[PDB]
Structure formats: C-alpha cells, structure tokens
C-alpha cells in the first residue's frame, strides 16, 4: 500500500494556504504554489 512510502507512495496533498490539491516539493515538503508547508497528505 502507501504505508512506509513504497512504490504506490502518497503524493496527493492539500494545501491549507491555497486550499487546493498539490504535489509537494519533496526535498522541502512545501507547497509548489505558495511554498508554505501547510499541506495535508490525502
């Protein structure tokens, strides 16, 4: 599954600042739009 990352690992995030679904910059774990960090792993 998506536990322990694995191949079908998570990626669909939801930024609280943009209130939209995003794919985070993994090296930073931030938003690709506002670069905040306030995101939810869906």
* Binding-site residue ranges for Zn(2+): 15, 18, 31, 34
Token duo for residue 17: 């600042």
Where is the binding site, in residues?
15, 18, 31, 34
Contacts (Cβ under 8 Å, ≥6 apart) of 39: 13, 14, 15, 16, 22, 24, 29, 30, 31
Residues in contact with Zn ion, shown as a per-residue x/- string from 2 to 41 under the rule CB under 5 A: -------------x-xx------------x-xx-------
Binding residues with Zn ion: total (CB under 5 A): 6
Query: Gap positions in the chain, given as the residue before each gap (C–N > 2.5 A)?
Result: none
Q: Which residues are at the interface with Zn ion (CB under 5 A)?
A: 15, 17-18, 31, 33-34
């Amino acid at each position: 599954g998506s536990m322990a990352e694995a191949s079908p690992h998570p990626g669909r995030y939801f930024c609280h600042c943009c209130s939209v679904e995003i794919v985070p910059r993994l090296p930073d774990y931030i938003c690709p739009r506002c670069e905040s960090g306030f995101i939810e792993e869906l």
